PDB file of C-alpha atoms and ligand atoms in Angstrom:
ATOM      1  CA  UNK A   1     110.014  64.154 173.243  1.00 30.04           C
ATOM      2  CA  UNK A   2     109.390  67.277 171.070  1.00 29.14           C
ATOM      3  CA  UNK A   3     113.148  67.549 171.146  1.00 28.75           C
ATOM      4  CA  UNK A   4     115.417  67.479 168.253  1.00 28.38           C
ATOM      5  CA  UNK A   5     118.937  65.944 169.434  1.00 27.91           C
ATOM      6  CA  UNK A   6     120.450  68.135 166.205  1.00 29.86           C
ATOM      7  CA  UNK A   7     124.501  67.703 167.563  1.00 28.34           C
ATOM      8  CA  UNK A   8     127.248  66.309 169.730  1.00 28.11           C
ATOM      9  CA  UNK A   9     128.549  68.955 171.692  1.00 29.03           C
ATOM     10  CA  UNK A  10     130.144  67.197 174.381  1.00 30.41           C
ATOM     11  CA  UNK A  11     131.725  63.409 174.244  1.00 32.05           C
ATOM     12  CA  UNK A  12     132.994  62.651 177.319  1.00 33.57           C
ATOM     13  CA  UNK A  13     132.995  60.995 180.505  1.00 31.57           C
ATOM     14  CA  UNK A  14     130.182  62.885 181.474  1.00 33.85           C
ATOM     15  CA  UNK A  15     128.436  60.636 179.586  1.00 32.96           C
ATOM     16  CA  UNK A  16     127.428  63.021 176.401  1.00 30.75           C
ATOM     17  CA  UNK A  17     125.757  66.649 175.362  1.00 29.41           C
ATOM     18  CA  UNK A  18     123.568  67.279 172.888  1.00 30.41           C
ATOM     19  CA  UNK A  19     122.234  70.378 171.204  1.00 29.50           C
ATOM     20  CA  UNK A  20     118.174  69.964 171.480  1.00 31.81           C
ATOM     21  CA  UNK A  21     115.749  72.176 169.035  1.00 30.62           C
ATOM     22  CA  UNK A  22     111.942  72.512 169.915  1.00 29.60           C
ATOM     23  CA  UNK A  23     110.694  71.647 166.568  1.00 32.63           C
ATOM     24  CA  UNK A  24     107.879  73.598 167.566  1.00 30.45           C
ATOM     25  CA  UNK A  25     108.590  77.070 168.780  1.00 32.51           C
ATOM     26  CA  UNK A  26     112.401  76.516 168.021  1.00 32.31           C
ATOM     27  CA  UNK A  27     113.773  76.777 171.189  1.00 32.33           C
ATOM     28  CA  UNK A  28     117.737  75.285 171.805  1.00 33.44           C
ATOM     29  CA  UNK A  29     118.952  73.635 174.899  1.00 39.85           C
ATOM     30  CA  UNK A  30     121.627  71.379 175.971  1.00 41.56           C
ATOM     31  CA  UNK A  31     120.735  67.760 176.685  1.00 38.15           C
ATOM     32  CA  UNK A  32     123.056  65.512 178.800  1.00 37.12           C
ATOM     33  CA  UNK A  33     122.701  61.777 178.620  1.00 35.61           C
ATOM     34  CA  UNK A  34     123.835  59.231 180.542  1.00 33.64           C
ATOM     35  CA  UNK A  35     122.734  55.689 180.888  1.00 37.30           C
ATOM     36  CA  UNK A  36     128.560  59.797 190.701  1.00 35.46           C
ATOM     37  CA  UNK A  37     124.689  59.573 190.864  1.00 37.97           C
ATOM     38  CA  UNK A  38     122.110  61.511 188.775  1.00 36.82           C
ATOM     39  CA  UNK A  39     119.168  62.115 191.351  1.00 36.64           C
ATOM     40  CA  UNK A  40     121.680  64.586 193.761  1.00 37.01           C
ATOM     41  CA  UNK A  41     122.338  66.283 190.363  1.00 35.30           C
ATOM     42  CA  UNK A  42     119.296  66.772 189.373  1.00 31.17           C
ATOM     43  CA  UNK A  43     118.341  67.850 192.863  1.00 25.33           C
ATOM     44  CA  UNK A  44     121.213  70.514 192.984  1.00 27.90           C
ATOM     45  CA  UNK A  45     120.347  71.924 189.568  1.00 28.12           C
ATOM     46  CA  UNK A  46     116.672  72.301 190.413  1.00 29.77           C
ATOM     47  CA  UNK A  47     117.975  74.325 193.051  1.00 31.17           C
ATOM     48  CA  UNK A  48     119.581  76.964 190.248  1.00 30.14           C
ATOM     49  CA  UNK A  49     118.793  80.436 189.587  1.00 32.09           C
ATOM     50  CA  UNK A  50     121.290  82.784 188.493  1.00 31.51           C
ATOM     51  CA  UNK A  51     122.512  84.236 185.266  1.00 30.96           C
ATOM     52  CA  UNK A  52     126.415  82.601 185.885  1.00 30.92           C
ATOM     53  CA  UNK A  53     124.673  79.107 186.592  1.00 33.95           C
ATOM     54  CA  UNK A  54     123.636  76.944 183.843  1.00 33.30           C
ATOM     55  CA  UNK A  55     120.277  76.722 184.406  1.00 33.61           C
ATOM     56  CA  UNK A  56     118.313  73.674 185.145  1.00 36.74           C
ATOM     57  CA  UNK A  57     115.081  72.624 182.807  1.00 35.90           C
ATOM     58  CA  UNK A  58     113.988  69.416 183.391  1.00 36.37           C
ATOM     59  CA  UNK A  59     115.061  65.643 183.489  1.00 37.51           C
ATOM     60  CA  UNK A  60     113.341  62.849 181.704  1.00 36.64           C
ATOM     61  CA  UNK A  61     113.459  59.100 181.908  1.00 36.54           C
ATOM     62  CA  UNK A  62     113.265  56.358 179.047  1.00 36.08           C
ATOM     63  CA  UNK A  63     114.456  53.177 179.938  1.00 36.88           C
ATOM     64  CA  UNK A  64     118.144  52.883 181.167  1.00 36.47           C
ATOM     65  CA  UNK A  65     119.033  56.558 179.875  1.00 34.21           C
ATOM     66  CA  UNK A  66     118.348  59.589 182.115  1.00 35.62           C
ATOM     67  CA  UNK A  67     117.834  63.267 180.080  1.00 32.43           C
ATOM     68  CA  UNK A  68     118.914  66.565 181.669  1.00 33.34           C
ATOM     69  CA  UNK A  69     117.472  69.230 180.201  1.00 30.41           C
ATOM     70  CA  UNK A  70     120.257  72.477 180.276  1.00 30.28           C
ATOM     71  CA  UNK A  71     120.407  75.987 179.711  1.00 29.16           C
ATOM     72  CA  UNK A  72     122.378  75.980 176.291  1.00 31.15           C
ATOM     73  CA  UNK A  73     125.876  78.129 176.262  1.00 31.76           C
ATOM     74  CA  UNK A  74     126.854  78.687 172.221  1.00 29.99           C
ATOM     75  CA  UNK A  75     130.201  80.190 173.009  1.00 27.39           C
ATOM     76  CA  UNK A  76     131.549  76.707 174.602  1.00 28.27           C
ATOM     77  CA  UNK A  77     133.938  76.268 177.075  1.00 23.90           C
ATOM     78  CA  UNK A  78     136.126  78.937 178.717  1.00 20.26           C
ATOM     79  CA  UNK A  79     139.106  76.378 178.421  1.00 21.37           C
ATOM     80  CA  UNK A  80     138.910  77.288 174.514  1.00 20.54           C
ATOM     81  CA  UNK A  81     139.488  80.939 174.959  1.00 20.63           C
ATOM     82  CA  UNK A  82     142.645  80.192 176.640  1.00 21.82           C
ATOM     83  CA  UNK A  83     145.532  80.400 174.306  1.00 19.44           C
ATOM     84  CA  UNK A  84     148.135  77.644 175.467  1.00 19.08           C
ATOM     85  CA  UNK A  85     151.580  79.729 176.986  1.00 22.42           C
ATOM     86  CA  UNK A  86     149.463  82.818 176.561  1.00 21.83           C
ATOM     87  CA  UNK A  87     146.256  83.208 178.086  1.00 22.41           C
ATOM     88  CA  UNK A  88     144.160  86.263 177.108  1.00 23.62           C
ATOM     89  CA  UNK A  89     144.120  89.893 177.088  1.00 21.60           C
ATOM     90  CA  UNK A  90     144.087  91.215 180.919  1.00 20.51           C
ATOM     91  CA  UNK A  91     140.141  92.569 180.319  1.00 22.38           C
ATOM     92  CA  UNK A  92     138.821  89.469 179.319  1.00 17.97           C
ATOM     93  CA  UNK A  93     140.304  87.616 182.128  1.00 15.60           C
ATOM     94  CA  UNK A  94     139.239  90.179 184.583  1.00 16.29           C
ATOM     95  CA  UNK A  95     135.256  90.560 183.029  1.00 20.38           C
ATOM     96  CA  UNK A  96     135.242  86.146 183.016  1.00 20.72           C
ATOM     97  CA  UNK A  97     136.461  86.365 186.608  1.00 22.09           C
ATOM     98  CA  UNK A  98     134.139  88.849 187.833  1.00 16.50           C
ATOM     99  CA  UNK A  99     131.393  86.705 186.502  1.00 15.67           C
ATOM    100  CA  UNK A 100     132.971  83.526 187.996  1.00 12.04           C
ATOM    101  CA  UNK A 101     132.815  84.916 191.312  1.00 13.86           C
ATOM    102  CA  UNK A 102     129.180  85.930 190.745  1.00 17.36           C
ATOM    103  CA  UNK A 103     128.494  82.648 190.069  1.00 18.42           C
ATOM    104  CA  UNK A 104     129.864  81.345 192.834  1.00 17.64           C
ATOM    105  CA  UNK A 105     129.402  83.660 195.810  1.00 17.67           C
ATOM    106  CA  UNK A 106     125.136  82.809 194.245  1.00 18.95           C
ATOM    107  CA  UNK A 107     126.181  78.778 194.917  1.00 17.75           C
ATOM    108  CA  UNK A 108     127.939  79.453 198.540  1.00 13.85           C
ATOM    109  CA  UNK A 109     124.914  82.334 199.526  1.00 17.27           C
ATOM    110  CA  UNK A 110     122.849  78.897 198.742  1.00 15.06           C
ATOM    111  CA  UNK A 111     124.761  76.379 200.702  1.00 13.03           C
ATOM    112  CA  UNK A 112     125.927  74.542 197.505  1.00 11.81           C
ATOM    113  CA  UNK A 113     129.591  74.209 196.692  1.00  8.09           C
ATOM    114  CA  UNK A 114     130.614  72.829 192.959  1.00  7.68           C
ATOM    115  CA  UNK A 115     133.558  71.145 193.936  1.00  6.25           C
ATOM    116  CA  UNK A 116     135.303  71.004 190.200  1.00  7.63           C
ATOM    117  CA  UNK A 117     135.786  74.237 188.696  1.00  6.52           C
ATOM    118  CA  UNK A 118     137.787  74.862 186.105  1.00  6.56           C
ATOM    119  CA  UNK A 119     137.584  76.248 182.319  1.00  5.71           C
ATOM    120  CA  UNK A 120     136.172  73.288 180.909  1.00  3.86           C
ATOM    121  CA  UNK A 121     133.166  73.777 183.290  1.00  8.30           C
ATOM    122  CA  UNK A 122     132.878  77.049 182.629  1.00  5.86           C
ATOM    123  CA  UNK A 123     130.331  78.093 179.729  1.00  6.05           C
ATOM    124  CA  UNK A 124     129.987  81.121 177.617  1.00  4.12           C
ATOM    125  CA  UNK A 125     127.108  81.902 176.074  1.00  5.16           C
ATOM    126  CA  UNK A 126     126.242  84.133 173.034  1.00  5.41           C
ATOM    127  CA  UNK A 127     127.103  87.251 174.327  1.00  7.55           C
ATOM    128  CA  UNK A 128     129.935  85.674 175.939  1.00  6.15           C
ATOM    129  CA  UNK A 129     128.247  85.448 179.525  1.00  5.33           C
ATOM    130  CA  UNK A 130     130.244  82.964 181.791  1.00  4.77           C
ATOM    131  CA  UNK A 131     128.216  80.043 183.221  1.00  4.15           C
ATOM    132  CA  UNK A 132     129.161  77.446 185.625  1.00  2.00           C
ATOM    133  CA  UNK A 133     128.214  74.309 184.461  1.00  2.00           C
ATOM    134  CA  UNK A 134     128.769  70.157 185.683  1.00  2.00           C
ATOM    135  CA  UNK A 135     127.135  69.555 188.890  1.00  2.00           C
ATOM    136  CA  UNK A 136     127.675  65.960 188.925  1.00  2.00           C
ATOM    137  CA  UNK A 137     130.492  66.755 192.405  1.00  2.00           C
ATOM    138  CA  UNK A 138     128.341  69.356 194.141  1.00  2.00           C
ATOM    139  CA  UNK A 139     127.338  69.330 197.453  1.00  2.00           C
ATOM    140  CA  UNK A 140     125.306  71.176 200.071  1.00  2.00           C
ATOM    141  CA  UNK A 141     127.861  72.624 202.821  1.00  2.00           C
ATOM    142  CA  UNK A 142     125.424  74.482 204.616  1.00  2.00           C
ATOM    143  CA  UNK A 143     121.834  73.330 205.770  1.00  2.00           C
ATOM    144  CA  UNK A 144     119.369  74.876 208.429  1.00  2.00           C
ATOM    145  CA  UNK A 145     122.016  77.523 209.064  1.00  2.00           C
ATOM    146  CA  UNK A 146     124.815  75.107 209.940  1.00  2.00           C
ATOM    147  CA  UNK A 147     127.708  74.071 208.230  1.00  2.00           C
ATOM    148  CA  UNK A 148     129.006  70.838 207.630  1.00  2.00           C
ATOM    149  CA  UNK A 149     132.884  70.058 206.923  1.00  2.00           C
ATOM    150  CA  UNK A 150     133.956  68.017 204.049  1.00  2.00           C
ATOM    151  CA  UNK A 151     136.091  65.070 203.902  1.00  2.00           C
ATOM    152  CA  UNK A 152     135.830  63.698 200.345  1.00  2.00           C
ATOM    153  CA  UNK A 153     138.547  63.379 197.587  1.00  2.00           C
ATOM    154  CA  UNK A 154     137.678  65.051 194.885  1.00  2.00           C
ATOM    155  CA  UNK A 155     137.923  67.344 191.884  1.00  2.00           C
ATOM    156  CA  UNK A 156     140.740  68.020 189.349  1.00  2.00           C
ATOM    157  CA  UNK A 157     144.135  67.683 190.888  1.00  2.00           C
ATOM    158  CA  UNK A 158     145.914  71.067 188.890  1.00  2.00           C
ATOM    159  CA  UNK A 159     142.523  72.712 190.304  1.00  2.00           C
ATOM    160  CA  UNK A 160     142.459  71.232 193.431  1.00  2.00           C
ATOM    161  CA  UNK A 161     143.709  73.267 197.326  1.00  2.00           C
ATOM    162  CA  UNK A 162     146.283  71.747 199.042  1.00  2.00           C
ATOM    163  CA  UNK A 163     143.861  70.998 202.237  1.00  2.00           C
ATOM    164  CA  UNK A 164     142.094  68.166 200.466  1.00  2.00           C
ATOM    165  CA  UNK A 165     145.556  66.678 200.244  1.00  2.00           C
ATOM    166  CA  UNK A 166     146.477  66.955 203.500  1.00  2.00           C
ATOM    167  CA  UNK A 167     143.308  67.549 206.084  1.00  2.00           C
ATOM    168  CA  UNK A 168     140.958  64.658 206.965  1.00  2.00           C
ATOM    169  CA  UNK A 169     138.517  67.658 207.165  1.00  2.00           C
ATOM    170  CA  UNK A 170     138.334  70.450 205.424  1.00  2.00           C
ATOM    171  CA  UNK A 171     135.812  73.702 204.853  1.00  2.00           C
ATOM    172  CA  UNK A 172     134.245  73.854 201.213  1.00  2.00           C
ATOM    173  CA  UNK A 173     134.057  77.513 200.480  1.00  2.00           C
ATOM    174  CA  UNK A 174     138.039  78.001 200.690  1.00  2.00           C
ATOM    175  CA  UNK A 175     138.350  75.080 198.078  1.00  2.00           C
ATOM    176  CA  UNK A 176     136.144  76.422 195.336  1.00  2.00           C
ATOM    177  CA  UNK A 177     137.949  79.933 196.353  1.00  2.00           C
ATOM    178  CA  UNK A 178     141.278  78.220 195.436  1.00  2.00           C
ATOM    179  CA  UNK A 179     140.483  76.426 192.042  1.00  2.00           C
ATOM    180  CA  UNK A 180     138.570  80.100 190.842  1.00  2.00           C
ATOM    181  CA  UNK A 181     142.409  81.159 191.391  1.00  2.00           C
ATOM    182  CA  UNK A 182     144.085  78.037 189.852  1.00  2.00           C
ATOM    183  CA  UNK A 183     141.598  79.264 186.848  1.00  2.00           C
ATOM    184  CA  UNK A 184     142.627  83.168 186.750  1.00  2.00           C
ATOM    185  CA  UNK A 185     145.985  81.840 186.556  1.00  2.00           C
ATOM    186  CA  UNK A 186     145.253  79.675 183.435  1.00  2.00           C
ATOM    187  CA  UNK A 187     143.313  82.778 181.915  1.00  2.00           C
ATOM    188  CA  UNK A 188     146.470  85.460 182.253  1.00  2.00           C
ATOM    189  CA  UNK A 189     149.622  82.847 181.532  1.00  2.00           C
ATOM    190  CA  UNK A 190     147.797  80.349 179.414  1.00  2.00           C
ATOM    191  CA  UNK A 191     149.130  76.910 181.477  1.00  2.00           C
ATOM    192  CA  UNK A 192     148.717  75.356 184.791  1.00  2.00           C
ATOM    193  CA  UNK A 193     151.163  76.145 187.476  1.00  2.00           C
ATOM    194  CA  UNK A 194     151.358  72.448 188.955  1.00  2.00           C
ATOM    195  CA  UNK A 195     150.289  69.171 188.430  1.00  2.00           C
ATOM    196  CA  UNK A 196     149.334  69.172 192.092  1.00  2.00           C
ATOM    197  CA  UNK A 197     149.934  71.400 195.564  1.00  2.00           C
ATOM    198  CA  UNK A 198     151.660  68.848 197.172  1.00  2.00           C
ATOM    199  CA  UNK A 199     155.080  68.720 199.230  1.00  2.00           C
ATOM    200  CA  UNK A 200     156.510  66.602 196.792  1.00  2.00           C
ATOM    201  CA  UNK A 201     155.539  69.176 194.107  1.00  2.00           C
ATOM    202  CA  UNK A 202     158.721  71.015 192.498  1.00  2.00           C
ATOM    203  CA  UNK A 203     156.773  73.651 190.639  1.00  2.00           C
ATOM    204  CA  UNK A 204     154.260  74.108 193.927  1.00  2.00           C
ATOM    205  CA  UNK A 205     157.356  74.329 196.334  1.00  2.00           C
ATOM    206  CA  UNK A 206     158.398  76.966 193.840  1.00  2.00           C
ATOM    207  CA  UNK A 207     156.233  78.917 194.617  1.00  2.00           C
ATOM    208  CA  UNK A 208     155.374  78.647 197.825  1.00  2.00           C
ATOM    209  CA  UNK A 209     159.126  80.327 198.076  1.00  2.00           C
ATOM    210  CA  UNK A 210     157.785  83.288 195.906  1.00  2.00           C
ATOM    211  CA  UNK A 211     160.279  82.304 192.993  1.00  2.00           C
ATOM    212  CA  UNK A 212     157.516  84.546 190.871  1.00  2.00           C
ATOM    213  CA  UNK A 213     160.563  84.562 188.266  1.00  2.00           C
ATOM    214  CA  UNK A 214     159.481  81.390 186.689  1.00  2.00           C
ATOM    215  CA  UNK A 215     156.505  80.566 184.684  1.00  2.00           C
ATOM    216  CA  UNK A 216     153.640  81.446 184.827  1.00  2.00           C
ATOM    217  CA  UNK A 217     153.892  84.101 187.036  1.00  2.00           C
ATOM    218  CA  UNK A 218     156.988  85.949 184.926  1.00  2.00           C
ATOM    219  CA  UNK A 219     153.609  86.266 182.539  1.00  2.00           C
ATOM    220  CA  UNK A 220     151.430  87.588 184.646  1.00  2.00           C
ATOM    221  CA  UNK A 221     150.948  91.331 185.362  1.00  2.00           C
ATOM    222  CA  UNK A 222     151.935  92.902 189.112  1.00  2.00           C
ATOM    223  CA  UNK A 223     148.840  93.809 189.788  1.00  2.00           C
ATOM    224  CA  UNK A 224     146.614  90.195 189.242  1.00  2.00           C
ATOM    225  CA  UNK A 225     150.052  88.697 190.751  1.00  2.00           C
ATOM    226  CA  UNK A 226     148.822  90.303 193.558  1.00  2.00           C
ATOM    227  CA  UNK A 227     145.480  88.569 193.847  1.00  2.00           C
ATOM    228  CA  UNK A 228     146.794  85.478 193.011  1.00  2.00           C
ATOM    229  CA  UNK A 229     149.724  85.808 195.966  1.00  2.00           C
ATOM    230  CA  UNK A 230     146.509  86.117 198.945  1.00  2.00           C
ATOM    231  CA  UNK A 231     144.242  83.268 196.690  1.00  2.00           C
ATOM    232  CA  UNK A 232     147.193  80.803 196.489  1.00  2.00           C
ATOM    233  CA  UNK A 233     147.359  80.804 200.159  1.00  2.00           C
ATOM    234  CA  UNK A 234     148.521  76.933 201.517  1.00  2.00           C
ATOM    235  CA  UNK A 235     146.746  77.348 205.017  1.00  2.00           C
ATOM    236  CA  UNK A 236     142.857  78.113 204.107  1.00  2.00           C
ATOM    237  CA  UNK A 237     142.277  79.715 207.360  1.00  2.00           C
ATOM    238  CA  UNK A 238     144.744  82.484 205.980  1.00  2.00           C
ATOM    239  CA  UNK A 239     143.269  82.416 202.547  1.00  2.00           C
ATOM    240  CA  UNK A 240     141.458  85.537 201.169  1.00  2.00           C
ATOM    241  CA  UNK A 241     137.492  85.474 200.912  1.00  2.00           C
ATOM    242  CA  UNK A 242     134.886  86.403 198.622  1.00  2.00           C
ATOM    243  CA  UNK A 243     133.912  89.398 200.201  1.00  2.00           C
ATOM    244  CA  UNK A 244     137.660  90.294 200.221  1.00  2.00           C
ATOM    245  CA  UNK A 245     138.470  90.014 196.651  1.00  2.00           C
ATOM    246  CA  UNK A 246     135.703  92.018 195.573  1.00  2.00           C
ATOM    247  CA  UNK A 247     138.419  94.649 197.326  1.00  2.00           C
ATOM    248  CA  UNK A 248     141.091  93.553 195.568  1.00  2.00           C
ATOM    249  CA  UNK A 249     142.624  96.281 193.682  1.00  2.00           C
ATOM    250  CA  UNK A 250     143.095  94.247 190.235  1.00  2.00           C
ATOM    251  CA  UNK A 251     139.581  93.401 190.985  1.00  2.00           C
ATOM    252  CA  UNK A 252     138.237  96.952 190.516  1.00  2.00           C
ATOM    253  CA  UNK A 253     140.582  98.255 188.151  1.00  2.00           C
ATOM    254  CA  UNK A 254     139.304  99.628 185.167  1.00  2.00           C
ATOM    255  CA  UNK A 255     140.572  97.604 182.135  1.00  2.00           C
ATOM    256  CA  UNK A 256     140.004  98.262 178.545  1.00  2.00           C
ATOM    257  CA  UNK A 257     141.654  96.853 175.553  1.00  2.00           C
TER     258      UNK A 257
HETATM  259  O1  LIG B   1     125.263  71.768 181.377  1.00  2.00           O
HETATM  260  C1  LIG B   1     126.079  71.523 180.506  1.00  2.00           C
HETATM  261  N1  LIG B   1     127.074  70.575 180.522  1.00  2.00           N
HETATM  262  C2  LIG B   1     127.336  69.517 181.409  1.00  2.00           C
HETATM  263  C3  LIG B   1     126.417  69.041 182.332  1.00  2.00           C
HETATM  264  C4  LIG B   1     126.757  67.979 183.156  1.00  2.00           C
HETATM  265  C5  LIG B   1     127.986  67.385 183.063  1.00  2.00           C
HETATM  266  C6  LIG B   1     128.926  67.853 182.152  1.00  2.00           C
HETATM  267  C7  LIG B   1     128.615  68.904 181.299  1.00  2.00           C
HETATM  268  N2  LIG B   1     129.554  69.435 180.406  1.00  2.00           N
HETATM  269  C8  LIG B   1     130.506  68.475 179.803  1.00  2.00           C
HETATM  270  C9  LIG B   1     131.396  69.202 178.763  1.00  2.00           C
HETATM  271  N3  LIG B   1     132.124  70.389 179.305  1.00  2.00           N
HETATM  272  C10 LIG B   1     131.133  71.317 179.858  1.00  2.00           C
HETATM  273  C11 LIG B   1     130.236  70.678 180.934  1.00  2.00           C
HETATM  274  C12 LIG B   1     126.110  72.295 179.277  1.00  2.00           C
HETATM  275  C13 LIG B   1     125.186  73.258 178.950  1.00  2.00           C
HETATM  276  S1  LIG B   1     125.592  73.944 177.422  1.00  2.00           S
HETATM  277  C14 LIG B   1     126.951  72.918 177.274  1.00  2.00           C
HETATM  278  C15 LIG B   1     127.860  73.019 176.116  1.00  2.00           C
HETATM  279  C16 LIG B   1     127.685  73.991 175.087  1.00  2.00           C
HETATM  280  C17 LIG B   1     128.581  74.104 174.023  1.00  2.00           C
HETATM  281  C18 LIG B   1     129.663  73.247 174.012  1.00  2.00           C
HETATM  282  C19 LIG B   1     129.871  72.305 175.006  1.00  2.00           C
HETATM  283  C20 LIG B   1     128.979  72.184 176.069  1.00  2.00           C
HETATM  284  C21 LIG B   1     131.103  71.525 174.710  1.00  2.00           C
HETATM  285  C22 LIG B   1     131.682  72.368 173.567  1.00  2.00           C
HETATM  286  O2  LIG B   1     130.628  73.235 173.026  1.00  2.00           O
HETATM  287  N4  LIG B   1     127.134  72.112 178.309  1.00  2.00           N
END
């Protein structure tokens, strides 16, 4: 390789990121190694072009240890902007989530759904640019013009809709709608507002019986509290869309700090 692995960026169970330098015209990318399965991954990602995706380079093989090849994102995760019990200022939230949902109406106009968003997942680069990163749970939804239902368990359970809980069958694009919301509610309050939207869930039941007086939502403003009351929506037939946030009124208000 005329890579340079220069840094550990990410140990995890993702195996493990590395900063790469071109030791020839200098160039940095991220390198994931490994060493559930790496050929739909890399398949996805070569799939990948948009400015909120982390883009997709190459893969390489050498003996037992596979190479992926990533766009590199200097400002990190989104998780670390998130100051626990307090979030960050209203403008910031609203500019990452406008770029989140860029990011992800581009994966749904493309059949793909990521399955596991949330703000450790989510990549900023210099300028701050959010990025959705981890493909290693995506899935196609949507093939030759037809969609296909999902069925599999999966994601991160504070992130996760209440569907996948309960529905031997569920649609993908109202999943990755709900975790984008289980995210702009981290972003404005700083914390997660359940370990999980089940029945047996005190803090979920909570709200499901508007008791907005409690935390998080005491935190957050009226107007993203609005948002958040048609995203947080148990039955994902009644859940707001895409298309319908982008008319949200915290949405397109002008914010400024
Ligand atoms: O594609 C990437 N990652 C990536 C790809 C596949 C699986 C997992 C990941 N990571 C694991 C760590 N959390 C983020 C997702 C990627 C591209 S740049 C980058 C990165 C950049 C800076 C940084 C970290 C990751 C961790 C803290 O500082 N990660």
């Amino acid at each position: 390789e005329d890579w340079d692995l220069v840094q550990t960026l990410g140990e995890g169970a993702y195996g493990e990121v590395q900063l790469a330098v071109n030791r020839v015209t200098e160039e940095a990318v991220a390198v994931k190694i490994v060493d559930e399965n790496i050929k739909k991954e890399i398949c996805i990602n070569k799939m990948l072009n948009h400015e909120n995706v982390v883009k997709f380079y190459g893969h390489r093989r050498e003996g037992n240890i596979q190479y992926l090849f990533l766009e590199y994102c200097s400002g990190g995760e989104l998780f670390d902007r998130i100051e626990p019990d307090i979030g960050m200022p209203e403008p910031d939230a609203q500019r990452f989530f406008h770029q989140l949902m860029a990011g992800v109406v581009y994966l749904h106009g493309i059949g793909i759904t990521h399955r596991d968003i949330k703000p450790e997942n989510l990549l900023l680069d210099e300028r701050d640019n959010l990025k959705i990163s981890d493909f290693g749970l995506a899935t196609v939804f949507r093939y030759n013009n037809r969609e296909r239902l999902l069925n599999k368990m999966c994601g991160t359970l504070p992130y996760v809709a209440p569907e996948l809980l309960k529905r031997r069958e569920f649609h993908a694009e109202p999943v990755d709608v709900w975790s984008c919301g289980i995210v702009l509610t981290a972003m404005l309050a700083g914390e997660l507002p359940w370990d999980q939207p089940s029945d047996s869930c005190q803090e979920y039941s909570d709200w499901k019986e508007k008791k907005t007086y409690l935390n998080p939502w005491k935190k957050i403003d009226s107007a993203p509290l609005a948002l958040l009351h048609k995203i947080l929506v148990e039955n994902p037939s009644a859940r707001i869309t895409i298309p319908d946030i982008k008319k949200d009124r915290w949405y397109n208000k002008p914010l400024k700090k």
